[PDB]
Structures are given as C-alpha cells and as structure tokens.
Design a protein around this ligand. Structure first.
Ligand code: NAG
Ligand code: NAG
Lengths: 12, 177, 180
C-alpha cells in the first residue's frame, strides 16, 4: 500500500 | 568560507506501549526555533527567533487541528504498515573467531541491534580482560560488534564465543583450539 | 521520550552541495528518499519498494515549503551563517578481512555541519572511481549530519587505503588510513 506524509507549515 | 544558509525540519513519531507521539521541529542552522508537540497540543517557540512563527501558527486553527490528527493519521498508519518489513525484521548474525595475544569474536550482518556476546574458556565464562566495541551501524540496515578477549594460551584449552540474539532461538557458538 | 521505535521524516534545504534532500528513517536507518532532479521515490532496500509506495511529490512539495521558510528565516536571522563543525572519520570493513574474499570498506563521516562534503577513496595513493557508493547526508538528533561511503575491494597485503574527507571546518583534507 502507501505511506503517509505531512505538510510542513509556512513561516511568517 | 562561502555563503551558505540551511533550513531543516523533522517530523518524528514516537511509538511506545501502543501510543504515538508526534513532534514537528523547525530548525535554522542547527538552531531549533519552533516546535509542535502532540502532548502540548499547539506550537511553541523554542527560541526568540521563532516567536512570530509560533504565534501566527496558533491563530490558524486548521493548522493546529491538522497537527493534532497526525499521531493517528500518519504515525499510527506507518507504524502498523511497516510492521513486517521494519519492526519484525530479523537478520541472523555471522560469527567468526580469529587470533589477530587476543582472540577476536567478530559478529557481522544483523539488524536487531540488541545483542549480547559472552566469552567462555573450558566452560567458564570469562569477564576479566574482555574488551567489546560499541554497536557499529553499517547503513545497510545491519550492525557489527567485535569482542576482544585477552588470553593466556594453554595447550588443550577450548575458547568458545557464544552469541545470543533476538533473531536466534538457540545461541550460536564458535570455538578456538 | 520513552519509545520502542522512532520513525522520522527528515528534510533540509541549503545554498550549496545538495540544495535539498527529503528522506524517511526508522530507528536511525534511512528507509527511502525522494530523488530531486529525478523526482521518484528511491528505496534503500529493494524489498521495501515491493511492499510500500510513496507519493514522491510530497517531498518535492515539502522541499518547496522549506525553501521559502529558508528565505524568510534568512531575512529575520540578519543573514547569520552557522559555525563549521569539523567531522570525525572512521574506516572499517563490513566483513572479516580475508585475503581473496571480496569485502566492503566502510568510511563513516560523523558530527559535521553544514552538509557540504567532498569524500574520495584512495588505493595505494591513486584515485578509485569504480566500485564506490555513498549514503545520503543523514541527520542527527543534535541537528548535525553524518554520512556513509562504501568501497568494494579484494583484501591484499600490498594495498593500503585512505578515505580523504574535505569540509569547510577543516584546515586541510583529512586522510583516514586503513590497511589489513
Ligand atoms: C501500558 O499500557 C497498559 C494498557 O493500557 C497499561 O496497563 C500499562 O500500565 C502501560 N504501561 C506504561 C509504562 O505506560
Ligand atoms: C569540493 O571540491 C570543489 C572542487 O574545487 C570545491 O570547489 C569545493 O569547495 C569543495 N568542497 C568542500 C566542502 O571542500
């Protein structure tokens, strides 16, 4: 199947 | 020295007793300035450089809600999926004995890092004069260890090196002389 | 933190050497990464690719996000560049050394920053270009980096090897000697 990931957020 | 600036981040999942803990780090040149901790619930500045970044992130509720779902959306998903290939990966070790007056028990190619190596002389476990190296990562998802034994060679003596590993049901032994 | 196992996504962007890298490690072992410039998921072991899959664009996206975070942090940090940390180099074989038995010479570079490195193998004082392999700029918990370099060889009593490492934190290249 597939592995998950996550978005790093944007800085000010 | 040339002009160079670096920005790095970490997305760490900590599994223990069936739980998952997510930490997201925001680093600029080895200086961690912003961090989200699942046990905390929101972003918090680790240094003065990251206060404006953490304050802006805590206002955006979707950002705070998305990160709180990571320990279950990503950490739990990958930990259960990578079970057979990573968690229950077992590679049997290879044992070699050479005299190089010391005796070297060279244990190579095994993945589960936890291992114990004991030296025996004529059935007697030797403790004095035993020098073992640290765990040696090969990068091939394999490990090494070398256990030296200072010996006073006697004719008829039998030096045996036993290895007990999670990848083995019975300990492996190799003898010298 | 109490943990039986630790799975971590690691990624960085910088100005020199590799401008980006996106990898995933399990218990400090790199499992897969996203090959920027080729934009496909490269698995460390072939058996990993047969049991899992990864959207390689998740790395390319995260790299683009870290790119603007770098520019934003470059401005707020008053254009501050970190101190060059010299590396520790160790050379050791993968298997017990036996004459005529093919082996792999492992050169481990550790505890350096920034991830800008020139590593080259030398056998009997001349460059070795074939049979060589290298690992990624692996991350450490203290935010420095370490790296692996491999060389396949046949152990001979005449050959003596060197792992030459060049870094900004060093005054001169570091020669790490090894022989059987
Ligand atoms: C682990 O989980 C079990 C079941 O919830 C609990 O009984 C035990 O106390 C936990 N141990 C630790 C160290 O958290
Ligand atoms: C690697 O070698 C190139 C070739 O001259 C050089 O420009 C670069 O600065 C070197 N990198 C390091 C870290 O020494």
């Amino acid at each position: 199947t597939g592995l998950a990931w996550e978005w790093w957020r944007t800085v000010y | 020295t040339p002009e160079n600036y670096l920005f790095q981040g970490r997305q760490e999942c900590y599994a223990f007793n069936g739980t998952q803990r997510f930490l997201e780090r925001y680093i600029y040149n080895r200086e961690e300035f912003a961090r989200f901790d699942s046990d905390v619930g929101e972003f918090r500045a680790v240094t003065e450089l990251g206060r404006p970044a953490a304050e802006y992130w805590n206002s955006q509720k979707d950002i705070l809600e998305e990160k709180r779902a990571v320990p279950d959306r990503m950490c739990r998903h990958n930990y259960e999926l990578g079970g057979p290939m990573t968690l229950q990966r077992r590679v049997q070790p290879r044992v070699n004995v050479s005299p190089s007056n010391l005796l070297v028990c060279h244990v190579t190619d095994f993945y589960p890092g936890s291992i114990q190596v004991r030296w025996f002389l004529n059935g007697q476990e030797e403790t004095a004069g035993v020098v073992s190296t640290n765990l040696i990562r090969n990068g091939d998802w394999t490990f090494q260890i070398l256990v030296m034994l200072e010996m006073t060679p006697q004719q008829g003596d039998v030096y045996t090196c036993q290895v007990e590993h999670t990848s083995l049901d019975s300990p492996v032994t190799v003898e010298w002389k | 933190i109490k943990a039986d196992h630790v799975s971590t996504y690691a990624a960085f962007v910088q100005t020199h050497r590799p401008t980006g890298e996106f990898m995933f490690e399990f218990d400090e072992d790199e499992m897969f990464y996203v090959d920027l410039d080729k934009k496909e998921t490269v698995w460390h072991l072939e058996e990993f690719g047969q049991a899992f899959s990864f959207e390689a664009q998740g790395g390319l996206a995260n790299i683009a996000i870290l790119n603007n975070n770098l520019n934003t942090l470059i401005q707020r940090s008053n254009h501050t560049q970190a101190t060059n940390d010299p590396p520790e180099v160790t050379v050791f074989p993968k298997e017990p050394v036996e004459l005529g038995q093919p082996n792999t010479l492992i050169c481990h570079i550790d505890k350096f920053f920034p991830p800008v490195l020139n590593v080259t193998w030398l056998c009997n004082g001349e460059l070795v270009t074939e049979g060589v392999a290298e690992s990624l700029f692996l991350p450490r918990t203290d935010y420095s980096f370490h790296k692996f370099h491999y060389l396949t060889f046949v152990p001979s009593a005449e050959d003596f090897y060197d792992c030459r490492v060049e870094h900004w934190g060093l005054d001169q290249p570091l020669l790490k000697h090894w022989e059987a």
